[PDB]
Design a protein around this nucleic acid. Sequence first.
DNA 1: CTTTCCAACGAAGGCCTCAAAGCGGTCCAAA
DNA 2: TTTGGACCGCTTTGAGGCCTTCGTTGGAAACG
Lengths: 172, 12, 18, 297, 42, 170, 297
Amino acid sequence: SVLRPLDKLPGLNTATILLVGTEDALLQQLADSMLKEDCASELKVHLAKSLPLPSSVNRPRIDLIVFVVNLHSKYSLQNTEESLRHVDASFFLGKVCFLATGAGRESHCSIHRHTVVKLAHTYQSPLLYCDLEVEGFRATMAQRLVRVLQICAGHVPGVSALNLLSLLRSSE
Amino acid sequence: GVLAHLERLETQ
Amino acid sequence: QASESKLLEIQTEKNKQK
Amino acid sequence: DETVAEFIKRTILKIPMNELTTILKAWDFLSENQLQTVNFRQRKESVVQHLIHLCEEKRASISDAALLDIIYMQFHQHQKVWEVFQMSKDLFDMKQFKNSFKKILQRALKNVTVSFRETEENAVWIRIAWGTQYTKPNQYKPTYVVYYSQTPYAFTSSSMLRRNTPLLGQALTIASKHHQIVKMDLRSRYLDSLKAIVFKQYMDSRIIHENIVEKERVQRITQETFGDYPQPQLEFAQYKLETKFKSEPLRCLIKFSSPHLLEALKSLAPAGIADAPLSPLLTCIPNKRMNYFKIRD
Amino acid sequence: STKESKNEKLKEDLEREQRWLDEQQQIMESLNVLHSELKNKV
Amino acid sequence: SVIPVLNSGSFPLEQLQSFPQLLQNIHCLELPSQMGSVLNNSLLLHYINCVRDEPVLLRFYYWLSQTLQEECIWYKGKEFTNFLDTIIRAECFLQEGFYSCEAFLYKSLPLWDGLCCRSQFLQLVSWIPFSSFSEVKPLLFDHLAQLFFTSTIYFKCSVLQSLKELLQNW
Amino acid sequence: PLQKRLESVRKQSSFILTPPRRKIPQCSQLQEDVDPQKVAFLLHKQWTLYSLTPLYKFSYSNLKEYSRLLNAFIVAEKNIKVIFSTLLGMKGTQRDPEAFLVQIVSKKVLWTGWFCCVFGDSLLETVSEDFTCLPLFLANGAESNTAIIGTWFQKTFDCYFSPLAINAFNLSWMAAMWTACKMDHYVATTEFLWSVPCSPQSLDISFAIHPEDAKALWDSVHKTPGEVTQEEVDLFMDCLYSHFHRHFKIHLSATRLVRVSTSVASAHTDGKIKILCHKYLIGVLAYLTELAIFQIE
DNA sequence: CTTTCCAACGAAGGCCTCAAAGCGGTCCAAA
DNA sequence: TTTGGACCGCTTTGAGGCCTTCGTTGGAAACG
């Protein structure tokens, strides 16, 4: 089931986020950091291990896609590229983002960061580096994700997803 | 100075 | 800049008599 | 004798001074007044010298020293690796069993230092110090064998038993009035876990988790395979495999090392590292009572 | 509050700048007089 | 120790305890075995300002770069903040930026969360050597924009102050 | 001067270029200047890795002065002596400086230090004439002695040792590199070690392959003769992972590789190196020499 | 056909480190 | 000002890592 950003209608001032990865505990902690504070708009969090997403007739709009990647394991990579085949190209227009964890510890980074940099640059998608283990870094990434959600969801008048993509674009 | 002031502003 | 030039010239001449 | 004196000294040095008193309460070879004459707050050299004085005042022998070593082994029971022997093919008596075992081991070559110590749950502990035809048995390379009355299993610490393994096995099976004796390939250090295994004696509704059916299935399968009870403390595993590639058979050899096995394996499926149903080669460790494995297609 | 904080920050930086300027001054006269003395000696 | 202990007709370095002594013996100074003590000793900084010596440049570069790497890896804090403050104070002098700090910031900016030592990081970008606006943007200003478009408004004012200071310095 | 072009070259150093292919080392006998006894002492020993900034004003002549200075520092810290030796034949090129050994002998060698650089020219291309570039340090002995020697070197030559680390990517690459090497005498089966990431100590998988099976699988996944390519390494790892999952349905790919051992040499992530065969020894150094540069730059 | 040694390497005793706690000195609360 | 109490200091020391030695079948090589 290929996911589409333009399937249904969203709720009244409602925003949704999707997190796809392997480490369930890290996803739960990241969602806890997400919902530590709530803005004016209500927020829904979805966590999944792989794509295509399980079928559900009651699925609301998923306005943001975030893939967590650990440089500690190639298994998370293979998961990401296998899951990437179950989403349309329209999500790639600023509705998709990549968050790499553990990049600071160069000794613990199994795969080289050049690989994920090339992967992100190939699809022209934003790339973010953070460490979920550290509480401060996790919190900072928490307001970062909340506010990028606010930008992409259309809550603030003036910009869209393609605008922020042209903002967050890398030179090469 | 003013940079320490801004940092103590994000502390809030 | 003036001090750098002065130190350069004094060092060069000092090595010059040596 | 000086040999027994230095043996007792070495055993005491092995014993932590914090529990030496308990050792005496378990040893009981020396009178309680002699124990009172020695304070344990003073220096280690002083206390060991006083213990040497006390044992020299009485008659120091090999049996009492061996009993002290046995009880030290009981209190520790963590410094040796244990293997399990099975006997197969109904009247028992302690005295005649001891007599027969002693006679067989004396008939082994000429002599051996054998000591017995009955323990709770019918745990007869036997300390054996081996000696050749022309030398007194050595007390620096001992072995321990644990026997349970009217049971088809026995435990052995194999530190130097590889020198003469069949002798101990035949002696044990003839003393146990059992015909067939075999060694299963099961080796571990936590002796109590071996005891258990051989006898089988062991919220923020805004978040909308997806694939929750997978999580609830994997946790249920893991719980059904492992169980709520604390799994036996097993520390080493090793599989020797030789199977066709199917992707001339490839010969593989894996060793699992863990301070607490059966728990990291229990957490693999919740962590998502392995599939929800683990392979039978890992789910039957307490079931099959097997530690070393060889499987072929 | 940022405006005050930067005001005193700039005042402190300016004072440090005059301190450094003063020190490098006598540094310059010392270097020049040493250079002249060495030139005259040779 | 973050700053190595100093170990020594050239004027001995230990005898350098007064400003007139430096004024008299500037010509016959000798380079220290380790120049880390040059940071907290302004006396040797005066000679460093004009020495323009190639080997000491590489020696201080490797020194400060490996020091920054070890401090950063050991952090994951107050001593690190104080050391970076001393580095910034020294950077205020010499009226020119260092390269070890530049390389460290280049390496750590993509990994930077934006809040570890924000006060320390944002004052180093002020002292960045002049370069064409075609190599720094792909490596430096991209992550700067990444933080800027998503971080706090006060952080935006912060980076604005940093860039205006950079413009002034350039 | 050198600083400007050095800035430019590390500005050009970005993680954008493809990883270049590496030439497989060939069977190379020890060089004539190489003393077999010295390397035999060096080989079959454990070494700890350290990366070093180029030496400042290092001379190979005044070795006795260095030895007496280290002895004075040691006695200041406190029947031992410090010996400096010069070792020939283990430089990758003529540009690479001469290598030397430092030994601590108790008047029985207890601590050994090796300074070397093989095929390391990028550092030598960006250095002035005064400095000596031997960024590779191998330590073998007590950690206290290593710390003391490091303190002396920091005080003397204005440099540090940094504990060099090896990630899973580099370790897998080097594993493929030595499994590409041809060994006449397969005297050690290849063996890999893993570690599941968990705060409590958990299972550590060790996976061993018979040398014949490993060589056959390698030649099956060997495409470019005499060269190793990233696709070869990736398919090697993928085949191993597929075999492991076919065996046990466990995704080994979600685990951290921590140690890789083969017939010729063995490496550990913390910085442990064991060398057995001299025929590829020199090439080994060259590879790890690049890592020192990659830590310096 | 027999005997002894090198090898394969396994293993456990011993060296070496440090994390633990009791004893000792010193400062500060109380008489 | 004097005395007791609690702090931090110091030494003692218990446990784990680790190198090396002992033991060694099993094969190879010499042979009454």
